[PDB]
Design a binder for this molecule. Structure first.
Ligand SMILES: [Mg+2]
Ligand SMILES: [Zn+2]
Ligand SMILES: [Zn+2]
Ligand SMILES: [Zn+2]
Lengths: 196, 86, 49, 140, 49, 265, 69, 513, 115, 140, 87
RNA sequence: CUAAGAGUAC
């Protein structure tokens, strides 16, 4: 995540030869989608990218304090003095074919945090394993090799689909199916059944 | 008092936009308001479908309930097929 | 760079969260709802230190 | 010496405060890029703000240009920077903590605020400067 | 660690359906962070200096 | 006859040239091959005998694997996967050894000049870490307080940048064509005037500017590329280009060989 | 922690330019931009590698060794 | 809690079909399906048993008819196992296995659709972009669950009733619930503009990318002096043959001067820029027509073809956004400032009239309520007018403008707030209240009703917010967050009660309910 | 955990060949060639050289998924012209051009005095 | 194969609109006063200015020989002969509407891959046009 | 059961097979095929039980009957042969 | 086992 609430996971990783490149050979460490920008209105993300580009070029530190008199116009003037397009756009080339991209790409350094949520701490699968001592149902949690809760509203969705047999198989064959002998005169389970 | 615009069939055939004056009231006294002379007793409506049910009947109460549910659903512009709310 | 301000209980670092409460010895007047027979209530949570 | 004063919310009811000294204390071509500010057309001030940016807390003082952002985004970042991975202490090697996460190469931000050098953020950073492109490259 | 050491909690239910305790009051100016609250059921009830 | 080359700048670690009379696909393929297809030597396995430093063992291993090593004669070495030895031998690897001790009262810097080649090289020109700066000390590997020791042995194999970026010899490669946008392969973003707002590239001096009245040339293709190859240091910068051409030629020849050998079966 | 061996983006070796950078900042009283340009770091990807580095290894070295020989 | 279930993070994949789900290899190795040994599948089941449980594909157990369960781990010691008809091989789930796929806040049936397994070499579930809308799933860290059916009946009904293509048109509002979204939606608009022309080399690649392309190169729209194909002409290959669609937008005629509207005849786009109204989840659109004319399978194939071709074109064309897209030129900013100043002057005049008691109260409310209503109306129309000026100024090459035009993301209000003016900040449907005694902040004097005093933010996000505007905006955002947190719980409770009330209602064989 | 080994990007797997040719039933005299352990580097070059040919009616390539290193190249030539022969000629032309380029670069580099 | 229609028009207006490569032109026939043309043309690839005399032809095919496309398009081999050799700008498209403007005037709508054309005139010389695919050939 | 069974000459239900009926028929037949039931159609090399049952349904060789239960407890017996599979 | 706390996606 950046410092403006732009969280996201890695969709894929490309090697250097496949990433788009500017005319100076600089390839990006990250590519993010434009559609994350307009609806969330994190303009500070773009302003901070521009400021960081200028700071990396000039060697100073970017003052991004909230209520100072630092405008986008001045940052763009500083960037233009460095030989770059003042708004941070660059002509990039497609990595697969080498052809120029018809659109120029917003490009620059930005500060990202690595968050504590990784996939390898969350992936979990269970075919069969330990059962709960009381209800003879699967235990809870991935730390105990548990099973996933098939909640009430999941059952309601499966009812809406009309899949009766799948629901029965979920609730009986996959969790707890127990055979019990019952009397015919009375309906109670008070039947002594010596199967041997 | 408000100025609304309904669709009245013109004598030549088309549906023309005809304006009318409509009274909005805070508070419900449907039984007593309905009998006031000068108003149209047939077309009177109320948000309180309980009053509609206890004055007009169970069927009219059902219609008012459907209309209220529909207003809630379409307040944000969403559309739900008729049969579900029915 | 450690700043302190915490206890070590059974080898675990414990911090006391600040607890917010209404101030004492202040006369506060509140209007009451229609169903209640009392209309306004003036209360003080008197306490001696 | 009576140069600064301590005010709580009760006393703050009975004072008039100037947001900044330069634009409000002295009696008052402008850059169109600058934000629009008002002079309040009143001179009876009793106190002045040391700096407006001191209304923010520890987590929000890390955000760059928080006033160009929508407020829920700032709340999201304030909540999500506590999950950032960095160096929590310099003596992590002599501590037996239950779980510890350390960056190999923490980097101080290129865009930094004035209030983050009292928080030692440049000394113990929690992120890295990545070259970012904003593009619909491959659809992934 | 710093934000945890400067944390304040308001003991109102957390399941209550009243929204007035959670809203950012005007008197909070300069005393608690305008945007540093948890985002679940403790939104506004848990504050930071 | 064929692709033509004229080089502007020749340096120890940079070469700047013009590649004319060639297709865009060929130039881009050459650039990609230079990026991630030239074999190079780099440390691959690390045995840590003693480490009392403040860095973790795999931290130091990651740093060591990124140290550039001489790869002039890397074509004589064999891959460890197609060698008959058990784990590593003299025909497929180079064994270095780092051994540092903090005997000084001040901090002792473990550089890459302290790496010592142990295995015999059989007369090849591989293995030596690349030294660039004037002081003579290589990459700063680690730091030692008094009384701390670091002893370890490294095995370096040959590999390409596809398997890991530590084997890449090419750094950043500048690639440009058509500086004046006469082919109209970009639509320039602008606010008032696209000519003022977009700075001219340094290569615009090498082409005739458009006459501003002539019609669009729809038959014109893309050629006359301007490229600049930088070298990390493992191999000389000219060898980067030459071996990239060779590797691309080898790939195409292998396609031909597979086609012909499955044609005869 | 300690200076990275190579630039993340392009791969230029910057691990041997740290002590020279500190010397230029100290002995020659150069500003950061001129010092970075003097070492040959022309792309901003490398300039951010050297410019923003925080050398935490010194703090670690202040503590006494766990195993002293 | 049930068995044979998995849960992990989800990532998008433009290269998967609509009804496919990418399954991590380790998850595929853990979850198993019991297949009854039959004369028709004895060989492959024997081979899977030989492969064992440590490599994929393979078998984890052998359930004998006697009930004894041979664990394939530690069974290689006993040697090869001879399979008998009627035994069961409990084996790793392979490709094309029907699996139920769920996202836990499951509010309707389409959040529990059935996918086909595709084994992939990473740690995340992979699903098509279009199917994320019924799931209400992003890729910012969302987790999803996977259930494996364990019998032929459940497998069959899961494929024949809950399949993704069968759920394209939902009964909820008799319109499709899946459409073209984000990058594909923006690229389809950029591709079908009249300016977009494609040369032969790219046309061949785009035609080859369509899986069901019949193998014929369409005649170019332009033959001399250079063969060029149009974007509509290449996109028309994905559209199935025999599809007619005619929509008339505002101001469109049989000739389209503005290229709006839509006319498709026999699967060829005669005219009209393709955007949200055509390929979105909208009634009467392309998805609805194709699925009601050719069947759900052809519609899912359409999803895949359109996504593939548009993603290829957009990959080799490019699309970005930056700070420069939020900047309006000088005269436009001057006019926006003039509009804001004029509206502030109108508010001041209304305030002057109200303070002189010359203001007359509207019938049905007090004087103060009428004054507040007038002030809020003036400020809102001021912000709208400034935003309209800013939107009019923006060129067609503006990226935010392009995204809004395509319908992929953003709105007019976002452009207005980012470029022109953030607007009026409200808490509980009212302007910022006097938290202090008769004033909002201690930086204002008492009884100040001016727009800046009670929370009007006249600066855009580009220009930045003054501290008072910043605090008022924080108050508004806090209100929004609290409202969201209350609404989710209230809706969950209401949804449970409603479902419990109506769970037993069913249509019977005499058509009664 | 599930991450595949990097050497799978370029090393041929066991039991698979570099090329496999399948006749195309959509159009006459058309074939589809699958290249294994290859990527855009070779595919784009081969495609462009084939399109330079005069008797090639159709030539395209695609990498179906970024996860796997392989690509498909469809070639359709005129009647009486084997698509395999067109592939052979494209490869031969590529090799000749690369050889000329290497010779030219070596000759140009040998003329440098500041290198 | 034969020219379904042929005339000489004078261009009265060229309208770029919101595009950079495509312009919509209106032309009046110089022979028949009742025939007029509206047409989208790729001006980048074939510049057209106002008050320009253009010979416009509509044909059912390009081969010189009479008719004896279903066959996939093939790049033009050297030495291939076709009607397009006599003209400067050739498009290919489909007719999607026939309209009765008046008792004698009719209009025909053509779409060449999204470039629209409307040709109007009396039925005594536009009767050759029919609902099919056609080539539009323009020379200056 | 004699009273419950509506006589075949006056059944009043739809002659079209419902989606649920088709899904359960395919599931039941595929389950029986998986357990070595005899096949009533000639196989063209297919090995998947579900597609075998689909082939059986396409040419109406499934010897099952649906017992449609009316809400009062009465039922109608519709053979798979005579049910029109329009969907 | 119970209790408590911090959370993640809605
Ligand atoms: Mg999400
Ligand atoms: Zn009994
Ligand atoms: Zn060896
Ligand atoms: Zn670099």
């Amino acid at each position: 995540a950046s410092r403006h609430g732009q969280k996201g996971t890695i969709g894929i990783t490309y090697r250097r030869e496949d990433m788009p490149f500017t005319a100076e050979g600089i390839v990006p460490d990250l590519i993010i989608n434009p559609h994350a920008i307009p609806s969330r209105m994190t303009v500070a993300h773009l302003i901070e990218c521009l400021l960081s580009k200028v700071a990396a070029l000039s060697g100073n530190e970017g003052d991004a304090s909230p209520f100072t008199d630092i405008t986008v116009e001045g940052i763009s003037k500083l960037l233009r003095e460095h030989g770059y397009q003042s708004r941070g756009f660059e002509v990039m080339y497609n990595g697969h074919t080498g052809k120029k991209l018809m659109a120029q790409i917003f490009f620059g350094p930005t500060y990202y945090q690595r968050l504590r949520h990784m996939v390898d701490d969350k992936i979990h699968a269970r075919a069969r394993g330990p059962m709960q001592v009381l209800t003879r149902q699967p235990v809870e949690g991935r730390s105990r090799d548990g099973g996933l809760r098939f909640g009430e509203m999941e059952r309601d969705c499966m009812i809406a689909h009309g899949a009766a047999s799948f629901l029965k198989e979920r609730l009986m064959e996959a969790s707890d199916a127990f055979r019990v002998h019952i009397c015919g005169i009375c309906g109670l389970m008070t039947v002594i059944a010596k199967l041997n | 008092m408000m100025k609304y615009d309904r669709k009245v069939p013109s004598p030549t055939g088309e549906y023309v936009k005809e304006p009318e004056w409509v009274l909005e009231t805070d508070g419900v006294n449907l039984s007593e308001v309905m009998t006031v002379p000068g108003i149209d007793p047939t077309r009177i409506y109320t948000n309180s479908f309980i009053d509609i049910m206890e004055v007009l009947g169970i069927e009219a109460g059902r219609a008012a309930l459907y209309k209220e549910v529909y207003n809630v659903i379409a307040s944000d512009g969403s559309y739900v097929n008729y049969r579900h709310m029915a | 760079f450690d700043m302190g301000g915490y206890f070590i209980i059974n080898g675990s670092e414990k911090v006391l969260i600040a607890q917010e409460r209404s101030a004492g010895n202040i006369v506060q007047v509140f209007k009451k709802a229609a169903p209640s027979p009392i209309s306004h209530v003036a209360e003080i949570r008197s306490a001696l230190e | 010496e009576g140069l600064v004063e301590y005010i709580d919310a009760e006393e703050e009811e009975s004072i008039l405060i100037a947001m900044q000294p330069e634009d409000l204390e002295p009696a008052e071509d402008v850059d169109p890029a600058k934000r629009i500010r008002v002079s309040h057309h009143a001179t009876t001030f009793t106190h002045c703000e040391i700096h407006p940016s001191m209304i923010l807390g520890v987590a929000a003082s890390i955000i760059p240009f928080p006033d160009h952002n929508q407020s829920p985004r700032n709340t999201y970042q304030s909540a999500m920077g506590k999950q950032a991975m960095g160096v929590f202490l310099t003596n992590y090697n002599v501590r037996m903590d239950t779980m510890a996460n350390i960056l190999y190469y923490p980097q101080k931000p290129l865009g930094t605020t004035r209030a983050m050098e009292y928080l030692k953020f440049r000394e113990l950073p929690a992120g890295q400067n990545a070259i970012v492109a904003i593009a619909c490259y491959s659809g992934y | 660690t710093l934000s945890h050491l400067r944390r304040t909690n308001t003991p109102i239910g957390r399941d209550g359906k009243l929204a007035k305790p959670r809203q950012l009051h005007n008197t909070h100016w300069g005393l608690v962070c305008p945007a540093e609250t948890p985002e679940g059921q403790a939104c506004g009830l848990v504050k930071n200096l | 006859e064929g692709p033509q080359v004229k080089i502007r700048e020749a340096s120890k670690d940079n070469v700047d040239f013009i590649l004319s009379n060639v297709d865009l696909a060929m130039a881009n393929s050459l650039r990609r091959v230079m990026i991630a297809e030239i074999p190079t030597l780099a440390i691959d396995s690390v045995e840590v005998e003693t480490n009392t430093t403040v860095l973790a063992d795999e931290f130091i291993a990651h740093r060591l694997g990124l140290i550039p090593l001489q790869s002039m004669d890397i074509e004589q070495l064999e891959y460890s996967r197609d060698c008959f030895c058990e784990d590593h031998c003299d025909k497929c690897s180079v064994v270095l050894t780092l051994q540092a001790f903090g005997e000084s009262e001040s901090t002792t810097n473990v550089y890459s000049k302290d790496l010592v080649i142990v295995s015999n090289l059989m007369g090849r020109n591989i293995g030596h870490p690349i030294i660039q700066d004037k002081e003579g000390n290589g990459v700063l590997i680690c730091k030692l307080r008094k009384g701390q020791e670091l002893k370890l042995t490294c095995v370096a194999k040959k590999g390409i940048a596809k398997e890991h970026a530590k084997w890449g010899p090419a750094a950043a490669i500048e690639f440009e064509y058509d500086p004046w946008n006469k082919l109209k392969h970009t639509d320039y973003w602008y606010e008032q005037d696209s000519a003022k707002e977009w700075p001219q590239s340094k290569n615009c001096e090498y082409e005739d500017p458009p006459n501003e009245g002539d019609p669009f040339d729809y038959k014109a293709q893309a050629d006359t590329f301007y490229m600049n190859v930088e070298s990390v240091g493992s191999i000389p910068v000219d060898q980067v280009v030459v071996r990239g051409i060779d590797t691309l030629q080898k790939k195409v020849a292998s396609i031909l060989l597979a086609l012909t050998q499955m044609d005869q079966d | 922690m300690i200076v990275p061996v190579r630039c993340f983006s392009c791969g230029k070796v910057v691990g041997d330019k740290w002590e020279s950078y500190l010397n230029l900042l100290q002995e020659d009283e150069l500003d950061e931009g001129t010092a970075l340009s003097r070492l040959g770091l022309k792309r901003y990807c490398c300039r951010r590698m050297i410019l923003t580095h925080v050398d935490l290894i010194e703090k670690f070295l202040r503590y006494n060794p766990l195993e002293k020989r | 809690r049930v068995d044979f279930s998995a849960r992990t993070v989800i990532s998008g994949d433009p290269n998967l079909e609509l009804d496919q789900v990418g399954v991590p290899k380790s998850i595929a190795k853990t979850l198993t399906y019991p297949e009854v040994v039959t004369p028709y599948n004895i060989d492959r089941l024997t081979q899977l048993v030989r492969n064992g449980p440590n490599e994929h594909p393979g078998a984890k157990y052998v359930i004998r008819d006697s009930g004894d369960r041979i664990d394939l781990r530690y069974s290689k010691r006993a040697g090869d196992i001879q399979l008998q008809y009627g035994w069961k091989v409990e084996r790793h789930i392979m490709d094309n296995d029907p699996v139920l796929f769920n996202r836990q806040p499951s509010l309707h049936k389409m959040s529990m659709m059935a996918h086909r397994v595709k084994v992939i070499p990473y740690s995340t579930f992979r699903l098509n972009l279009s199917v994320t809308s019924p799931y209400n799933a992003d890729f910012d860290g969302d987790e999803m669950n996977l259930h494996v059916p364990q019998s032929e009946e459940t497998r069959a009904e899961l494929s024949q009733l809950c399949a993704v293509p069968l759920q394209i048109v939902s009964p909820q509002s008799n319109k499709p619930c899946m459409g073209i979204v984000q990058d594909t939606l923006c690229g389809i608009r950029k591709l079908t503009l009249r300016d977009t022309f494609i040369e032969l080399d790219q046309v061949l690649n785009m035609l080859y990318w369509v899986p069901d392309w019949d193998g014929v190169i369409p005649t170019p729209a332009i033959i001399k002096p250079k063969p060029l194909w149009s974007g509509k002409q290449i996109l028309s290959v994905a559209i199935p043959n025999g599809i007619h669609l005619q929509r008339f937008d505002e101001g469109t005629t049989l000739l389209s001067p503005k290229d709006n509207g839509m006319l498709i005849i026999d699967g060829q786009i005669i005219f009209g820029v393709v955007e949200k109204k055509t390929v979105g989840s909208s009634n009467g659109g392309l998805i609805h027509v194709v699925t009601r004319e050719k069947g759900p399978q052809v519609c899912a194939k359409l999803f895949g073809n359109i996504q593939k071709v548009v993603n290829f074109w957009l990959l080799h064309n490019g699309f970005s956004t930056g700070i420069g897209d939020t900047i309006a030129d000088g005269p436009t900013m001057r006019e926006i400032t003039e509009t804001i100043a004029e509206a502030k002057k109108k508010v001041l005049d209304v305030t002057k009239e109200a303070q002189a008691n010359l203001l007359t109260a509207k019938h049905g409310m007090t004087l103060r309520e009428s004054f507040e209503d007038n002030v809020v109306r003036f400020l809102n129309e001021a912000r709208d007018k400034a935003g309209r000026l800013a939107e009019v100024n923006l060129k067609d090459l503006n990226n935010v403008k392009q995204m809004v035009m395509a319908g992929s993301k953003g709105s007019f209000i976002n452009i207005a707030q980012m470029s022109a003016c953030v607007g009026q900040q409200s808490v509980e449907g009212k302007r910022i209240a006097f938290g202090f005694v008769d004033r909002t902040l201690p930086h204002f004097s008492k009884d100040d009703y001016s727009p800046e005093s009670k929370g009007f933010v006249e600066n855009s996000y580009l220009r930045g917010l003054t501290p008072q505007e910043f605090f008022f905006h924080a108050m508004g955002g806090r209100e929004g967050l609290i409202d969201t947190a209350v609404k989710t719980a209230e809706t969950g409770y209401i949804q449970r009660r409603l479902v419990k009330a109506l769970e037993d209602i069913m249509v019977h064989y005499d058509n009664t309910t | 955990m599930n991450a595949p080994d990097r050497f799978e990007l370029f090393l041929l797997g066991e039991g698979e060949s570099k090329l496999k040719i399948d006749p195309d039933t959509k159009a006459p005299n058309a074939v589809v060639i699958t290249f294994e352990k290859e990527d855009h580097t070779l595919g784009n070059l081969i495609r462009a050289e084939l399109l330079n040919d005069r008797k090639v009616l159709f030539a395209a390539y695609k990498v179906e998924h970024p996860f796997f290193a392989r690509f498909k190249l469809r070639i359709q030539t005129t009647e009486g012209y084997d698509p395999k022969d067109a592939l052979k000629n494209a490869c031969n032309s590529i090799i000749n051009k690369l050889g000329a380029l290497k010779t030219n670069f070596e000759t140009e580099w040998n003329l440098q005095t500041l290198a | 194969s034969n020219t379904l229609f042929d005339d000489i028009f004078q261009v009265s207006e060229v309208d770029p609109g919101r595009y950079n490569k495509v312009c919509r032109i209106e032309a009046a026939s110089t022979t028949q006063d009742q025939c007029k043309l509206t047409l989208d043309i790729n001006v980048e690839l074939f510049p057209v200015a106002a008050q320009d005399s253009l010979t416009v032809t509509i044909a059912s095919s390009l081969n010189l020989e009479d008719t004896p496309a279903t066959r996939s398009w093939r790049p033009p081999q050297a030495g291939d002969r076709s009607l397009a050799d006599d003209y400067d700008y050739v498009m290919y498209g489909t007719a999607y509407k026939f309209e009765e403007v008046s008792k004698d005037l009719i209009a025909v709508y053509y779409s060449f891959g999204g470039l629209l054309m409307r040709l109007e005139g009396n039925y005594r010389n536009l009767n050759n046009l029919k609902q099919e695919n056609a080539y539009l050939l323009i020379r200056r | 059961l004699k009273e419950k069974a509506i006589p075949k000459d006056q059944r009043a239900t739809t002659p079209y097979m419902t989606k649920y009926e088709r899904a359960r028929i395919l599931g039941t037949r595929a389950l029986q095929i998986s357990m070595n039931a005899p096949v009533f159609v000639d196989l063209e090399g297919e090995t998947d039980p579900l597609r075998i049952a689909m082939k059986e349904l396409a040419e109406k060789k499934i010897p099952l009957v649906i017992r449609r239960y009316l809400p009062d407890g009465s039922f109608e017996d519709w053979s798979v042969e005579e049910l029109i599979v329009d969907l």
